[PDB]
Design an enzyme around this catalytic site. Structure first.
Site, mmCIF file in Angstrom:
data_model
loop_
_atom_site.group_PDB
_atom_site.id
_atom_site.type_symbol
_atom_site.label_atom_id
_atom_site.label_comp_id
_atom_site.label_asym_id
_atom_site.label_seq_id
_atom_site.Cartn_x
_atom_site.Cartn_y
_atom_site.Cartn_z
ATOM 1 N N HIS A 1 -7.696 -0.471 -4.764
ATOM 2 C CA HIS A 1 -7.615 0.219 -3.288
ATOM 3 C C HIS A 1 -8.472 1.188 -2.733
ATOM 4 O O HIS A 1 -9.141 0.911 -1.798
ATOM 5 C CB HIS A 1 -6.213 0.384 -2.943
ATOM 6 C CG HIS A 1 -5.061 -0.893 -3.050
ATOM 7 N ND1 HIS A 1 -4.137 -1.070 -2.070
ATOM 8 C CD2 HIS A 1 -4.863 -1.788 -3.733
ATOM 9 C CE1 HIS A 1 -3.620 -2.081 -2.133
ATOM 10 N NE2 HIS A 1 -4.133 -2.614 -3.158
ATOM 11 N N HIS B 1 -5.932 9.192 -0.409
ATOM 12 C CA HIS B 1 -6.057 7.813 -0.778
ATOM 13 C C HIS B 1 -4.865 6.894 -1.056
ATOM 14 O O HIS B 1 -3.922 7.566 -1.353
ATOM 15 C CB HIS B 1 -7.001 7.658 -1.763
ATOM 16 C CG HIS B 1 -6.557 8.202 -3.372
ATOM 17 N ND1 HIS B 1 -5.961 7.463 -4.299
ATOM 18 C CD2 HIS B 1 -6.712 9.290 -3.737
ATOM 19 C CE1 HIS B 1 -5.760 8.083 -5.239
ATOM 20 N NE2 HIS B 1 -6.195 9.656 -5.135
ATOM 21 N N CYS B 2 -4.991 5.838 -0.845
ATOM 22 C CA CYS B 2 -3.929 4.731 -1.490
ATOM 23 C C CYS B 2 -3.985 4.765 -2.875
ATOM 24 O O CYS B 2 -5.138 4.724 -3.505
ATOM 25 C CB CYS B 2 -4.163 3.286 -0.941
ATOM 26 S SG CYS B 2 -3.146 2.058 -1.444
ATOM 27 N N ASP C 1 -1.302 8.836 -1.151
ATOM 28 C CA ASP C 1 -1.094 10.174 -2.180
ATOM 29 C C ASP C 1 -2.242 11.088 -1.415
ATOM 30 O O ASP C 1 -3.614 10.907 -1.114
ATOM 31 C CB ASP C 1 -1.919 9.845 -3.316
ATOM 32 C CG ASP C 1 -2.447 10.827 -4.323
ATOM 33 O OD1 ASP C 1 -2.451 11.846 -4.245
ATOM 34 O OD2 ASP C 1 -2.551 10.381 -5.453
ATOM 35 N N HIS D 1 0.894 -1.374 0.112
ATOM 36 C CA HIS D 1 0.033 -0.020 0.102
ATOM 37 C C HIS D 1 0.800 1.359 0.059
ATOM 38 O O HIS D 1 2.056 1.186 0.137
ATOM 39 C CB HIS D 1 -0.825 -0.127 1.191
ATOM 40 C CG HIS D 1 -1.729 -1.192 1.422
ATOM 41 N ND1 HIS D 1 -3.129 -1.396 0.848
ATOM 42 C CD2 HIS D 1 -1.592 -2.336 2.282
ATOM 43 C CE1 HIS D 1 -3.641 -2.339 1.069
ATOM 44 N NE2 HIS D 1 -2.791 -3.091 2.396
ATOM 45 N N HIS E 1 -4.234 14.692 -1.734
ATOM 46 C CA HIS E 1 -4.502 15.577 -2.735
ATOM 47 C C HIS E 1 -3.874 17.080 -2.236
ATOM 48 O O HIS E 1 -3.990 17.929 -2.783
ATOM 49 C CB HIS E 1 -5.795 15.519 -3.030
ATOM 50 C CG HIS E 1 -6.364 14.346 -3.928
ATOM 51 N ND1 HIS E 1 -7.527 14.353 -4.197
ATOM 52 C CD2 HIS E 1 -5.768 13.289 -4.470
ATOM 53 C CE1 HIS E 1 -7.686 13.343 -5.033
ATOM 54 N NE2 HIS E 1 -6.752 12.833 -5.280
ATOM 55 N N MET F 1 -9.954 2.574 0.986
ATOM 56 C CA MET F 1 -8.609 2.955 1.364
ATOM 57 C C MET F 1 -8.557 4.467 0.929
ATOM 58 O O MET F 1 -7.697 4.834 0.074
ATOM 59 C CB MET F 1 -7.322 2.190 1.070
ATOM 60 C CG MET F 1 -6.262 2.214 1.990
ATOM 61 S SD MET F 1 -4.970 0.846 1.611
ATOM 62 C CE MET F 1 -3.988 1.557 2.824
ATOM 63 N N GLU G 1 -29.538 24.099 -1.334
ATOM 64 C CA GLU G 1 -30.126 22.959 -1.173
ATOM 65 C C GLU G 1 -29.320 21.657 -1.098
ATOM 66 O O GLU G 1 -29.217 20.655 -0.308
ATOM 67 C CB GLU G 1 -31.506 22.795 -1.884
ATOM 68 C CG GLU G 1 -31.185 22.650 -3.337
ATOM 69 C CD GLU G 1 -32.620 22.609 -4.268
ATOM 70 O OE1 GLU G 1 -33.668 22.016 -3.851
ATOM 71 O OE2 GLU G 1 -32.716 23.351 -5.158
ATOM 72 N N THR G 2 -28.568 21.728 -2.359
ATOM 73 C CA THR G 2 -27.687 20.213 -2.739
ATOM 74 C C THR G 2 -26.457 20.877 -3.465
ATOM 75 O O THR G 2 -26.611 21.926 -4.071
ATOM 76 C CB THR G 2 -28.634 19.491 -3.758
ATOM 77 O OG1 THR G 2 -29.864 19.249 -2.974
ATOM 78 C CG2 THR G 2 -27.983 18.308 -3.787
ATOM 79 N N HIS H 1 -28.160 12.888 -2.785
ATOM 80 C CA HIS H 1 -29.653 13.106 -3.323
ATOM 81 C C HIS H 1 -29.738 12.553 -4.686
ATOM 82 O O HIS H 1 -30.669 12.870 -5.667
ATOM 83 C CB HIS H 1 -29.896 14.609 -3.246
ATOM 84 C CG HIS H 1 -31.430 14.850 -3.181
ATOM 85 N ND1 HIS H 1 -32.320 14.575 -4.012
ATOM 86 C CD2 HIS H 1 -32.054 15.463 -2.123
ATOM 87 C CE1 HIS H 1 -33.405 15.003 -3.650
ATOM 88 N NE2 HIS H 1 -33.375 15.600 -2.298
ATOM 89 N N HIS I 1 -27.241 16.461 0.662
ATOM 90 C CA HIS I 1 -28.250 17.032 0.973
ATOM 91 C C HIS I 1 -28.722 16.950 2.413
ATOM 92 O O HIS I 1 -28.718 15.724 3.060
ATOM 93 C CB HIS I 1 -29.383 17.093 0.014
ATOM 94 C CG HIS I 1 -30.782 17.604 0.300
ATOM 95 N ND1 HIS I 1 -31.104 18.630 -0.497
ATOM 96 C CD2 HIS I 1 -31.882 17.344 1.317
ATOM 97 C CE1 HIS I 1 -32.024 19.337 0.093
ATOM 98 N NE2 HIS I 1 -32.541 18.528 1.098
HETATM 99 O O1 LIG Z 1 -4.574 11.706 -6.613
HETATM 100 N N1 LIG Z 1 -4.901 11.281 -7.593
HETATM 101 O O2 LIG Z 1 -5.129 10.077 -8.075
HETATM 102 O O1 LIG Z 2 -35.542 16.553 0.627
HETATM 103 N N1 LIG Z 2 -34.525 15.594 0.776
HETATM 104 O O2 LIG Z 2 -34.883 14.273 0.038
HETATM 105 CU CU LIG Z 3 -3.737 0.217 -0.177
HETATM 106 CU CU LIG Z 4 -6.543 10.941 -6.364
HETATM 107 CU CU LIG Z 5 -34.901 16.034 -1.224
#
Ligand SMILES: O=N[O-]
Ligand SMILES: O=N[O-]
Ligand SMILES: [Cu+2]
Ligand SMILES: [Cu+2]
Ligand SMILES: [Cu+2]
Ligand SMILES: O=N[O-]
Ligand SMILES: [Cu+2]
Ligand SMILES: [Cu+2]
Ligand SMILES: [Cu+2]
Lengths: 333, 333, 333
Positions: B138, B128-129, B91, B88, B93, B143, B272-273, B299, B248
């Protein structure tokens, strides 16, 4: 004291049209009274005759667009006639508390309820049915619409100046999950409860069979194309209660776009295409500059042209050859 | 000279809780020391007993939320015990160079490594891995986690004033691709390497079988519902390392949302979302105004209520009838 | 009077390279003359030898990047040689009227046409073929590219100061829907019209079989990796004419990102990942700070590493141990 406020009754109209309203509030805060009657009905959704049991607010997919101003109260009388077969409710994404109203509005066939909420946040918002344990089933049966909460002083641009629309349309976009036999043929059913027994499996594919505007393939075309004139300012509200979409005006733009629908934010300018997340309403403002036919699509063009997420505008007026011209028409030389 | 800086050790906690930190930096830049131990383990992800081999940072899906300030140094001791079976790495970001650290942190069972990076950009970020040739395998085995890099002066609104949260939660959303027999039944396996041999085909469908918060259907419900009080300000960090989501709060809003997670940008208001792209962390700030049960969902309501991307809040306090009330409770007249 | 303006002929180059242009306009408005010749051709899209009939603008997938300034006129001579078999056209999302030009540019084999439009809105924009009733088929056969409309005064940051790139690349991302036999094997065909008869069904699954940069798995790797130096400022334009993507520079960031591509809007800062909706071009600016290999992906990592949406940069220069270092290299203790 809410009892001292004006009450105004609104009669809703069928999408893609929108009830009459004032952009700039001409009164103080009011209690705005709406009535919607739930209707379960068979609906033919494509040119092939595919039939679903639609679960509708006020007889249409989408449900009608409600329009109020910020810090008005929405008072909705929701009616579930005993001609229906299911328990329904309503969740306003515009509202605060009680699962957007869903916890307070559960109505069996033969019942009604009245909900009031304060529209504290300006924007366009989804509303949808959401019965415990049956939420995606009701939503993806068409039981969703939208509400617009205008700022009291109307819409404003990215610099604080007025944006005033001449026309407004509401495009509801609906993903359907029509169950199929082993060969791929769409099933039909006599009741919603019969349809339900194949529904969860169809939904779990995450692959809609149909994606339509205003409830059917081709609904916003022909005698029902949207219309405008060169020079007219048009607001297109667009909702998708369950699934992402990416609207695009073919031969135009979104001059001002609230892609996630909330008017306290400055709009995005000059968009070609924008992402409205599932569970959201968005709004695009455009001033037409050219006559002729436009298409308005979800720009996953498969979803548009194969699955049904395409409508048309017919625009009148003066062609502008500065803006575009055919210099040499298609020919063999 | 990094050797002249303070070193501070942090002991991480299990999601959705977040280790103790200061919003406004109370010291100068520091080297912030974290230790994570990789654990491969069987995990039951649904009510039906479906079992996967989870590949975890620190025993959980998601991995824990790390929290530092802008221009701190993150120093991670990553431990791969010889009780594990795979190679493993990690990374970030948040980090700059060497594939986010992945090129420098490849650890076989029985090995450890220590990576240091400067947290030069404020925001929430996925980690993430990502082992060469096995990256989606992974990640979609769980992961992945997130790191928050706070501005040294804390969070600010769209106008430059402070936003101070009272509570913070970390919702990791995980798409799983559990292989099926010809009839659709989920397979189980004795080891991760057995599971791997059906994994690429399952992944290539682009259709998750499960989509869960905090590692299982129902994980953020019941005795593990998230909690708040009316009046409390809550930041919900949400990550998805591989696939888009659309959070949401049912019966609320994102008052201030960094949908793509980066605090140098003004937040979107009154959402809202919102769309958190796959490969991203986002963050939503909300002040609760109503008591009771909320749901917090992806949502796409199928993904939420059928595939598992739904949790709950239980909120204490005073109901506000101005904000919402049942005028006429459901009844037959 | 357009006839009084300068005419400048541009010879296009093959993606991911971009024709020579000035960021800041060194002349007044011009008529910028482009010629593109349509080519239908067999293309091998993966390491396995899978072959499709590509429908190309100028021989490549994507088509070439066109570059003009705001309020220039684009004058495109579009040539459909009689060695091709289908009717094609072109829709510019940058253009206003006539379905972006599609209504005016329908050319049969053996025909040509010349379209002129005014580039009234600055940004990167998709262009694509769109023949009535065959739109997704042409687009998902590779018949799409992009046009950049620079502001006359070049690019500016979120505060109004100049952003000047040293290098520019164009990454076209293409979803293909290769039809399969019952066991899942990809079919090959002798002509585009043979391929068409399995295409609508393959498309309607909404599940691409391949998702590639610059027309094939691995196209932007090896001798064709993208290149830069530490300190160099790079603009990466990225389009997806039919389907959402989520770009990510592994080990970097988008320092300034116009995720939906339109330069009148301030860029998003410090992005890890951003959502480019299907039907859109976006643009990310980054200044490299570390040497070595980077990957540039769609961060649905399945789409990236299994389906082909991954390329590489090779960056020269000075490693910065302040920014990142291995404190203890992987070892067993
Ligand atoms: O971090 N990029 O897969
Ligand atoms: O309003 N949320 O499903
Ligand atoms: Cu891994
Ligand atoms: Cu990435
Ligand atoms: Cu909704
Ligand atoms: O350009 N709209 O397909
Ligand atoms: Cu209902
Ligand atoms: Cu074509
Ligand atoms: Cu288009």
């Amino acid at each position: 004291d809410i009892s001292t406020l004006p009450r105004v009754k609104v009669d809703l109209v069928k999408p893609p049209f929108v009830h009459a309203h004032d952009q700039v509030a001409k009164t103080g805060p009011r209690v705005v009274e709406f009535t919607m009657t739930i209707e379960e009905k068979k609906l033919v959704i494509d040119r092939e005759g595919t039939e679903i049991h639609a679960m509708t607010f006020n007889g249409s997919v989408p449900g009608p667009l409600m329009v109020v101003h910020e810090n008005d109260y929405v008072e909705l009388r929701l009616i579930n006639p005993d001609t229906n077969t299911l328990l329904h409710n309503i969740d306003f994404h515009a509202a605060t508390g009680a699962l957007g109203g869903g916890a307070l509005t559960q109505v069996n066939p033969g019942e009604e309820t009245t909900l009031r909420f304060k529209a504290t946040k300006p924007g366009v918002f989804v509303y949808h049915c959401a019965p415990e344990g049956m939420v995606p089933w009701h939503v993806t049966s068409g039981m969703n619409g939208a509400i617009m909460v205008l700022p009291r002083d109307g819409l404003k641009d990215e610099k604080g100046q007025p944006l005033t629309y001449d026309k407004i349309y509401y495009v509801g976009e609906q993903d359907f999950y029509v169950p199929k036999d082993e060969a791929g043929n769409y099933k039909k059913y006599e009741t919603p409860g019969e349809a339900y027994e194949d529904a969860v499996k169809a939904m779990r594919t995450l692959t809609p069979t149909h994606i339509v505007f205003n409830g059917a393939v081709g609904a916003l075309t022909g005698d029902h194309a949207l219309t405008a004139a060169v020079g007219e300012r048009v607001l297109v509200v667009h909702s998708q209660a369950n699934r992402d979409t990416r609207p695009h005006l073919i031969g135009g733009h979104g001059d001002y776009v609230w892609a996630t629908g909330k008017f306290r934010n400055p709009p995005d300018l000059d968009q070609e295409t924008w992402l409205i997340p599932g569970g959201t309403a968005g709004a695009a403002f455009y001033t037409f500059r050219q006559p002729g036919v436009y298409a308005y699509v979800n720009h996953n063009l498969i979803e548009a042209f194969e699955l049904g997420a395409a409508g048309h505008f017919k625009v009148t007026g003066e062609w502008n050859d500065d803006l575009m011209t055919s210099v040499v028409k298609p020919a063999s030389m």
